[PDB]
Ligand binder design. Structure first.
Ligand SMILES: O=c1c(O)c(-c2cc(O)c(O)c(O)c2)oc2cc(O)cc(O)c12
Ligand SMILES: *[C@@H]1O[C@H](CO)[C@@H](O)[C@H](O)[C@H]1NC(C)=O
Ligand SMILES: [Ca+2]
Ligand SMILES: [Cl-]
Length: 496
């Protein structure tokens, strides 16, 4: 469960948050395959509650009604078509599995669901997925409210309702089997793995029992015996009894400390500096690299009130964001997930965004298609960070330097740092309020290299900055604190 199952050489996955299946299928063919992306995390593909008070919020997708592959992203035919087309070009699909719970206990009964299935939260009746009151933790939870009230009690966090979400009795073989039936339908369709939503709210042993019921990947696309990639969404910032290490026997875990600390370092909060990143990784109290799923931001915390708070960097902070994503993609620690978002009317009121609930761009509730502009950016309010030159080229940088050691570290005692990846890549950062002009040891063979941040290598020439490495492996780097992107990256495949 620890291997991503991406093609050799492809080292990242991209979260195409709220994208429709037909648009992801096209994206796999026209961009993800040629640009070296390993795979895509898709939004929950199972039927969810259609919420209309706040109009179709993104979070309605985390309130299941059934396991039918029928959502605003598309139906089962559209989902299968996307998995087949993506797999046919070597780009994998990872499903966001919402398996800890069904919808909120106070949601009204009826057919207000993405596939019209009937459901009655009050009576614990979800007939589309034979689930009844016998399949929930109402009698197991010990809190006075029935909801999670205190994170200092690890039992309560697993057996009670997360903000009222009906909590499935995951100890029951029937419930484990209905979840495995859903996950195996997806594996047999061709998915390569899963993001296990709300993993902190599930017992490590219950997750293990479900994973033990899962098939190996579809043998028409994957080698025999390939186990699905599992990355568990566990929010562990160190202040509670639940530790993400309790989940290592099931697969990888999301390392939320990664984006939180990279955000405080790049924002320079409480005196933090990039020079402090030499020991980035386990040295900062993070999980083992081989169990980490890393990212700068995710769909939830990019809204400001999630794991990491206001320190999280997002596309809204474009300049610093590209630098954070660049550092992440250059550094060997963990398996990287790049975020791809949609723009919404962010409106801050008393320190909080009152529009953080806004769902994807839409016409009367129907998600808008992703349009591609001649300059390769996206229209219809899709941000497409994965298409930004500075991010896409760093996704390729990670591929080129795959397996290469962290070496040749340099720092000015403040925010000007640099490091290489063996003899395959080198990156330089300037987050100080002054210029960086210095000759550094790069560890790379002599020659002319194109900076893949300010430009590209096209037709044997560089469209942006050019770096000259001499026979001694040294090269001079000049980065003004007022440059569009205060960082330079060069690698074996950007060499002229
Ligand atoms: O609708 C909601 C929802 O889905 C989630 C949610 C959060 C997670 O961390 C999950 O893992 C998850 O599956 C769902 O947040 C919520 C928090 C609220 O206060 C109210 C809500 O209505 C939701
Ligand atoms: C490099 O760019 C110049 C134009 O600036 C062009 O004449 C030359 O042919 C390019 N080199 C290659 C190898 O295409
Ligand atoms: Ca639970
Ligand atoms: Cl996540």
């Amino acid at each position: 469960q620890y291997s991503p199952n991406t093609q050799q050489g492809r080292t990242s996955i991209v979260h195409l948050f709220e994208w429709r299946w037909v648009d992801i299928a096209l994206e796999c063919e026209r961009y993800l395959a040629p640009k070296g992306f390993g795979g895509v995390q898709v939004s929950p593909p199972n039927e969810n509650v259609a919420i209309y008070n706040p109009f179709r919020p993104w979070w309605e997708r985390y309130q299941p009604v059934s396991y039918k592959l029928c959502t605003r992203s598309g139906n089962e035919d559209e989902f299968r078509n996307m998995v087949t087309r993506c797999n046919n070009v070597g780009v994998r699909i990872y499903v966001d599995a919402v398996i800890n719970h069904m919808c909120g206990n106070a949601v009204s009964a009826g057919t207000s669901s993405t596939c019209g299935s009937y459901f009655n939260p009050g009576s614990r009746d979800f007939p589309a997925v034979p689930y009844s009151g016998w399949d929930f933790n109402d009698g197991k939870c010990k809190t006075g409210s029935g909801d999670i009230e205190n994170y200092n009690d690890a039992t309560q966090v697993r057996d009670c309702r997360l903000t009222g979400l009906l909590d499935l009795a995951l100890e029951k073989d029937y419930v484990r089997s209905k979840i495995a039936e859903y996950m195996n339908h997806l594996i047999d369709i061709g998915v390569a793995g899963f993001r296990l939503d709300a993993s902190k709210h599930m017992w490590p042993g219950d997750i293990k029992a479900i994973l033990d019921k899962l098939h190996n990947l579809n043998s028409n696309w994957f080698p025999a015996g390939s186990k699905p990639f599992i990355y568990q969404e566990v929010i562990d910032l160190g202040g509670e009894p639940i530790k993400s290490s309790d989940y290592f026997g099931n697969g990888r875990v999301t390392e939320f400390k990664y984006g939180a600390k990279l955000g405080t370092v790049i924002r320079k909060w409480n005196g933090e500096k990039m020079s402090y990143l030499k020991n980035w990784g386990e040295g900062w109290g993070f999980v083992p690299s081989d169990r980490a799923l890393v990212f700068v931001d995710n769909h939830d915390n990019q809204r400001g009130h999630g794991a990491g708070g206001a320190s999280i960097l997002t596309f809204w902070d474009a300049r610093l964001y590209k630098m954070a994503v660049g550092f992440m993609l250059a550094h060997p620690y963990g398996f990287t997930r790049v975020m791809s978002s949609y723009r919404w009317p962010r409106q801050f009121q008393n320190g909080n965004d009152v529009n953080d609930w806004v769902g994807p761009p839409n016409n009367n509730g129907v998600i808008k298609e992703v349009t591609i502009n001649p300059d390769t950016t996206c229209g219809n309010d899709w941000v497409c960070e994965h298409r930004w030159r500075q991010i896409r080229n760093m996704v390729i940088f990670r591929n080129v330097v795959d397996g290469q050691p962290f070496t040749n570290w340099y720092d000015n005692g403040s925010n000007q740092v640099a490091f290489g990846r063996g003899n395959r890549g080198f990156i330089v950062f300037n987050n100080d309020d002054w210029s960086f002009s210095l000759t550094l040891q790069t560890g790379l063979p002599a020659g002319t290299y194109c900076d893949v941040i300010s430009g590209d290598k096209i037709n044997g020439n560089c469209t942006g900055i050019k770096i000259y490495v001499s026979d001694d492996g040294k090269a001079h780097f000049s980065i003004s604190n007022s440059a569009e992107d205060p960082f330079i990256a060069i690698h074996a495949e950007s060499k002229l």
